[PDB]
Design a protein around this ligand. Sequence first.
Ligand SMILES: Nc1ncnc2c1ncn2[C@H]1C[C@H](O)[C@@H](COP(=O)(O)OP(=O)(O)OP(=O)(O)O)O1
Ligand SMILES: OC[C@H]1O[C@@](CO)(O[C@H]2O[C@H](CO)[C@@H](O)[C@H](O)[C@H]2O)[C@@H](O)[C@@H]1O
Ligand SMILES: [Mg+2]
Ligand SMILES: [Mg+2]
Lengths: 412, 556
Amino acid sequence: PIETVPVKLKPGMDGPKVKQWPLTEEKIKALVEICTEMEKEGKISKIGPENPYNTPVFAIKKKDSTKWRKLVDFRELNKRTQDFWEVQLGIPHPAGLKKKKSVTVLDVGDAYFSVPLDEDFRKYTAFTIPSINNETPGIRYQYNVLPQGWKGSPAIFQSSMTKILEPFKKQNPDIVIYQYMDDLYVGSDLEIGQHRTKIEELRQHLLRWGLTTPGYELHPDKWTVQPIVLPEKDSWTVNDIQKLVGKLNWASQIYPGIKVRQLSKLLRGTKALTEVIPLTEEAELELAENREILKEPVHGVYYDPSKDLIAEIQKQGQGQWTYQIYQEPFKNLKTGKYARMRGAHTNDVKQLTEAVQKITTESIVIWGKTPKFKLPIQKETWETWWTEYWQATWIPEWEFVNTPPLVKLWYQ
Amino acid sequence: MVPISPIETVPVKLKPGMDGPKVKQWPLTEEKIKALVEICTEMEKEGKISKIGPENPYNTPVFVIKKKDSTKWRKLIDLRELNKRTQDFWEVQLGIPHPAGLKKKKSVTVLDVGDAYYSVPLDEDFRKYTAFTIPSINNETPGIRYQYNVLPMGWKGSPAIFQSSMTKILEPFKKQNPDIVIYQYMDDLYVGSDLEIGQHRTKIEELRQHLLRWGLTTPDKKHQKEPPFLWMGYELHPDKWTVQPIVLPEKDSWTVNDICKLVGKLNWASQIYPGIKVRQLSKLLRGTKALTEVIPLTEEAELELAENREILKEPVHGVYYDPSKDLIAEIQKQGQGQWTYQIYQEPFKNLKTGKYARMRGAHTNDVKQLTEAVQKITTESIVIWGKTPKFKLPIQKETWETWWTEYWQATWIPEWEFVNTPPLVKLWYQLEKEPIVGAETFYVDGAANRETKLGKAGYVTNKGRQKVVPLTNTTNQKTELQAIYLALQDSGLEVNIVTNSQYALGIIQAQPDKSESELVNQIIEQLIKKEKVYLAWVPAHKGIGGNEQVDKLVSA
DNA sequence: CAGTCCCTGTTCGGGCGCCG
DNA sequence: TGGTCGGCGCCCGAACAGGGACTG
Ligand SMILES: Nc1ncnc2c1ncn2[C@H]1C[C@H](O)[C@@H](COP(=O)(O)OP(=O)(O)OP(=O)(O)O)O1
Ligand SMILES: OC[C@H]1O[C@@](CO)(O[C@H]2O[C@H](CO)[C@@H](O)[C@H](O)[C@H]2O)[C@@H](O)[C@@H]1O
Ligand SMILES: [Mg+2]
Ligand SMILES: [Mg+2]
């Protein structure tokens, strides 16, 4: 008997209609068990084909969890609700969260099940559960409460949430707390043990409101960037200088102060690639000045809240991956490298999956947004395997690129 | 309450601001007219149909087709205009069951619902839109107007409503009988238990009573107590299954429509018959105008069709699924981007077979295509069995390792082992990571005039070797490839090549072994003959070395 | 600095096969 | 006679997206 906030789609936009993809027997068993209990508790109820909207569903295990978590791919719905959770009931972003020595992430998704959902909106949360070998037709449901992974859930529940919070905010005025979808980011500057302890306190506070909390610990101050770097060589072949000029010329789209004139002079002839070329003093100084510029920041790179984040990833080999986050081309808000992630040297898709997750997490902490990924993989290769390695409760937007690397500019 | 209500109906609105169908009836031949009138009058006694006064201002055509393998006729109401204006549904039929999915069962019963569409009530408010006008032997007698009281064949909401309604009815019985397997596909029900045959039939009849309660009738005529069962186009035996026999047209002269039927049958056959190849038969269908047009068979499509027919000569069968044993998929390269595979558990006892022939990309190699086939098999397996088979692949472990570690795209194959069945899949050539000492360095470039389509391709080298060649009806891209082809032709077994063409460098670095472009194929031919090739890229128009000089030559 | 042209790759709707 | 519905599969060709290189 709680009031239901009415919700509407962005004007001129119909509800999501997205086919359910095939699921493994292990995932289907988990979903059937999860949905049976949710139906019994009234969180969801069965629906007919007259509802014309569907959203994909699947199950994940969070890192080390071993316990299945239902996960709905609400990206299409969230795009059609978009104006609602931005222009009205949204959450501000604590610019200080990235500065805290430790940040823990908690899954508060269960809380959303408390609140009910606008009766007119429930038609849009429909999801079908498939059957192995199509023994049965699809078993369709819809949500009677606030669904996990929908972007209206944290907004509708923000009023309820802040009240549950405010006692703990007032006992610790220095602890920063941020809410992104199903997750609560809790950032303290405390020492490790005190930090973990304060997390238990915020757990109990959630407990006396009837919310269960089954955490991820970050260290955003450790986070660093990956500068463009130029090789150090005792001797330079013609091929080496040709590589260097190509990298510097591309880099000049980012740092306009890069100059290749004196380095180009070294390759005036028509020379064998392996011929050793002594550097002149003028080129040594031009190269020195260049290395310094690349240490510097790009002029006038600042985050813009209106514009979308874009993430680009490159596979550098040997378990190493490089990424750039930006909004405008060549104005990069961050650039980084990942190495020796899970699956290194055996599984590219597991590694790319881990990379997408880590990059999305940083964007949530730094900017409270998730970027759109340009993924260096074939669409069919990614779609076949990615869910197998996914351990997060959100799902970013992605697209697929096929661009081979004419210059290894980012790694070295 | 003139008409009784039987089971939970499904609300069905029209599309907003739109109104019911009106369109005049077909000039139906009197022979057809006889069949409809008898059945339609019978419906009214049951309550399936009701008469309507002209207060119902809706007319939609109607027609009838003979039931295949029966004397009976099927009564179809065309609703193309009503579909257009009826609300959209979400289809609940997510695919087709495959017999290879089925586990072995001691007792199997297949039963068919009778008048299944007609046994499901249509939405009361929506009933008005059904209206159609009956025909007479002459045009003098008007004929009665009728509105369906139940689902009508030919609507676009009929299958999903029936399937969803059928599942709801079955669900209580399934919950009381957790160990019975019911494959529900439309109105056909497959029931399997490990109960002994007498006890199984008790459940079967007990299930029949349950369906009767909702007005669903299972006639004995379509009841299938005894093997071999006929189910989804397959013949089911206690330990094996096979497709119901496939007849391939014998025509001496083939039209276009002929090849389509042929091709589509051979695709159906390839789910069990290993090694079916449709490549050359499909080549005949590319870029043709008339479905009626006659087309002659090449000696390629003929040889293909010959061995395809011979594969069908011997009977083959698949087995059933044993969850205890592993799933194994083995793949063979069939040439010309054709791949076949077998999925099995016991060696030589196949669950099913299949083929992957899709040509993807203008330039590709066998390793990419094998990766595509592995993905197609993996998704197909997850649908049928919910797990990924172990793979036996005709590619050396080191070949795969060299490809995936070096490729710039993320790529992966699930757990697999090498099978030494030729032809093995390999990389035909490898580009060097570093420049080759003592190998001649070819600076290559080409340019072409957008208007004239004239161009030059040429090279310059550190030894002083030079060439420029004029070309006609070309493009900038084509001349950049040509320059590289020239450097490869005119070089020794080891060569360094410097290009500024990102286009060409991208094609060649992906190690293609086949291409749509003949020019790329020739470049491949040369790459294979070399011992060492180093390709390097520099930016154009930067005053670099040989690149500047060759740029001047080809620009001229 | 737009506007093309190449070239590639995706998507989508057509035909057929198969199942109700 | 020619004519309906949904599902899945294949192979096709056309229509569309978008990224570089070059033209003014
Ligand atoms: N050619 C078709 N066009 C439209 N709907 C069809 C067609 N064939 C089958 N269906 C639908 C309607 C049927 O009610 C349902 C089942 O098919 P089917 O079993 O062959 O007929 P039926 O169940 O109505 O009669 P019966 O039980 O005596 O065989 O699937
Ligand atoms: O990965 C491509 C796949 O996306 C689908 C299926 O889930 O769409 C989801 O992912 C897209 C890309 O991030 C979103 O833009 C979209 O809104 C979301 O539903 C597919 O239809 C598409 O083939
Ligand atoms: Mg029937
Ligand atoms: Mg050129």
